[PDB]
């Protein structure tokens, strides 16, 4: 048999089989409930929609995300997502196939305990494991050594890995994330007199962010130039055919990653946490962490974020040491691809937490065995 590999971002479920080249299922990890009065007796009725159903019907629905900042915030929604994943989308009985599950590096242990319990009690998967995403991105990118910046829908985190040793004091976590770029994006789009005030409408904002955002290679220049005269300004079609037109502003959201002062976050931007992460590392390794920067996760996908990073961290590093940035075009998937590799390694077969060993040990075992 072949393990299942299932990855929960905040923003998508990515699922498929171990040793497959790319995930068999992707859908937004979103649960919708009908809010309005059902008129038509004898039309279909459902207590909930999941994924591409809630996409297809969003206007009628309150859409809510079960995961906020890599924390599963209520469990019946999550259970319903996993159910939809194994039975409806992948058509696999979980009892037959072991499963591999994915998490952000610092979130509460209760997350792992509940995520275990639901897997053994509800689905009776033969065996389970949990892996820190930044570990997986190195498997995906063919490296043993690097610092991974990984940024999802709900969390951004740094984990430096030198030659197969993760380095836990090194590790840093920010909650600047795609969702909280979007929640800013609405508020500044209000400056142009558009307003997007419901979750179904908010997803339209996210489609704007995905299509038209980009990162300023340097920010004050374009903030002066586009305000002076705008060639750059570009315009988008809402679902009803209204055309709406966005100028300087489309860069101003990606810049929040580099200046959380806009949102009022305490922290420094991702570049300064990346530098402070390598500065936490031992001087012996730092030469190779500077070279192997790996970008990971969809929030990195904004055009120019690579070169803005390569430029801005170079200013902080000493000139003699040199900076290289790696952002393969598939990087959004890479956290899944690394799980596809890891789950298929023959050595891994010892790694897994097994129905017998859980049944003896209690769900606390995941802290002890898994890391």
């Amino acid at each position: 048999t072949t393990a299942l590999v299932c990855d929960n971002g905040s923003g998508l479920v990515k699922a498929g089989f171990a040793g497959d080249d790319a995930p068999r299922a992707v859908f937004p990890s979103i649960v919708g409930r009908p809010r309005h009065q059902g008129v038509m007796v004898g039309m279909g009725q459902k207590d909930s929609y999941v994924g591409d159903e809630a996409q297809s019907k969003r206007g009628i629905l309150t859409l809510k995300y079960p995961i906020e900042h890599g924390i599963i915030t209520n469990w019946d929604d999550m259970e319903k997502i996993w159910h939809h994943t194994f039975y409806n989308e992948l058509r696999v009985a979980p009892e037959e196939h072991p499963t591999l599950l994915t998490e952000a590096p610092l979130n509460p242990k209760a997350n792992r305990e509940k995520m275990t319990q639901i897997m053994f009690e509800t689905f009776n998967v033969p065996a389970m494991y949990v892996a820190i995403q930044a570990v997986l991105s190195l498997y995906a990118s063919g490296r043993t050594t690097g610092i991974v910046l990984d940024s999802g829908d709900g969390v951004t985190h740094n984990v430096p890995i030198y030659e197969g040793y993760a380095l836990p004091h090194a590790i840093m976590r920010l909650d600047l994330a795609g969702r909280d770029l979007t929640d800013y994006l609405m508020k500044i789009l209000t400056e142009r007199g558009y307003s997007f005030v419901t979750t179904a409408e908010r997803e339209i904002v996210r489609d704007i962010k995905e299509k038209l955002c980009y990162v300023a290679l340097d920010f004050e220049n374009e903030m002066a130039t586009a305000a002076s005269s705008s060639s750059l300004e570009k315009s988008y079609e809402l679902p009803d055919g209204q055309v709406i037109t966005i100028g300087n502003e489309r860069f101003r959201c990606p810049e929040t990653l580099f200046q959380p002062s806009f949102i009022g976050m305490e922290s420094a931007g991702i570049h300064e946490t990346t530098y402070n992460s390598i500065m936490k590392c031992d001087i012996d390794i730092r030469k190779d962490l500077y070279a192997n920067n790996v970008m990971s996760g969809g929030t990195t996908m904004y055009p120019g974020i690579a070169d803005r990073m390569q430029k801005e961290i170079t200013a902080l590093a000493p000139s003699t040491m040199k900076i290289k940035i790696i952002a393969p075009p598939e990087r959004k998937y890479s956290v899944w691809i690394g799980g596809s590799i890891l789950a298929s390694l023959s050595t891994f077969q010892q790694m897994w937490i097994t129905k017998q060993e859980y049944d003896e040990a209690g769900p606390s075992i995941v802290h002890r065995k898994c890391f």
């Binding site: 995961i67 906020e68 900042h69 924390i71 915030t73 509460p108 909650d175």
Partner: peptide, 7 residues
């Protein structure tokens, strides 16, 4: 979360 943040 349980403290410093809404989740």
């Amino acid at each position: 979360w349980x403290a410093x943040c809404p989740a």
